[PDB]
């Protein structure tokens, strides 16, 4: 009864830690773009978030599928074997809710850079 309750709270903590990990991956693509005064695609032309290598697992590792990261990603509405940054951010269920009406890209501009505004929008969910 008590040791079972402990293990549910570890599973909740594992899932949150995974969600934060995905936001970290997204946020580091966004900073890579900002650094190279570059744009970022977040649709199917952008990165695939269902990729073992992003979270420490090698490509064919069978325990990838048992990971709390894959658990989160593969349970979303938007999952289809692959998962774009927009699919993840707009997908449910996850504890940061949803982001609707994001464009498929945020291109580098010289004034009010849309990459910068996206960085801020994404950063206000890791909070």
């Amino acid at each position, epitope marked *: 009864n008590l040791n079972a309750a402990r293990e549910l709270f570890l599973d909740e903590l594992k899932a949150l830690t995974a969600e934060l990990k995905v936001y970290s991956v997204i946020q580091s693509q966004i900073n890579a773009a900002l650094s190279a*005064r570059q744009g970022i695609r977040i*649709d199917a032309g952008g990165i695939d978030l269902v990729d073992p290598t992003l979270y420490g697992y090698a490509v064919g590792d069978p325990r990838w599928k048992d990971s709390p990261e894959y658990a989160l990603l593969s349970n979303l509405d938007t999952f289809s074997g692959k998962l774009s940054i927009k699919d993840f951010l707009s997908g449910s269920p996850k504890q940061s809710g949803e982001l609707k009406g994001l*464009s*498929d*890209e945020y*291109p580098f501009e*010289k004034d009010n850079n849309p990459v910068g505004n996206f960085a801020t929008t994404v950063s206000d969910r890791s909070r």
Partner: antibody
Amino acid sequence: VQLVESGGGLVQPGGSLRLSCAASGFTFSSYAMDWVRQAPGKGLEWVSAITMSGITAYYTDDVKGRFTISRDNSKNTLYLQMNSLRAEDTAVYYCAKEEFLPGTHYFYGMDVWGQGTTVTVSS
Amino acid sequence: AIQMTQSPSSLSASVGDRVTITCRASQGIRNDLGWYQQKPGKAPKLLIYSASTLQSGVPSRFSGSGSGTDFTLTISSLQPEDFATYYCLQDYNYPWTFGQGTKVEIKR
């Protein structure tokens, strides 16, 4: 490197034209693209730009809600759909490739231009 | 918004002279300003970008200068090939906007 425009001609006020620009001898999908126009005797007017992906478009004020820029990267082709045309749209329309600073999407100008295609709007 | 005002609208000079065209922005545009050359019935050609960087192939007599709102194209020793119209372009804000042009005519 080469850009060849086509699709210009004669049209009446309120009518429609589709301009095409055929790119060759460079990786079309890696560069942003523009339309620039020049009315007879007047100077250059930037009309529209589009990102390498073809997803985000930008427009000059005279043209907003009338023209639509687009591209097909599998065809190496840039388009300009021109609706609600009027006499003042009469001009040579140039297709132009944008260039970025090395390793960036930091746009600095148009280093390759087409020869232009003429559009004439009149009753 | 951003309006570019070149001057003079036109200008006369001889082979060998030192020519100077000015372009003024209605607002700050950093160094995000290019210069283009056009000749009659021909496509424009980029000469200078980022206010002062020479496009490769453009000869050294051309040179660019300025920051913020006031900029300057300069041909140190004008040549027969340089008689043409010159336009400035800001790309700091969308819509990008050209100057109204500056014709360089042969003097006599």
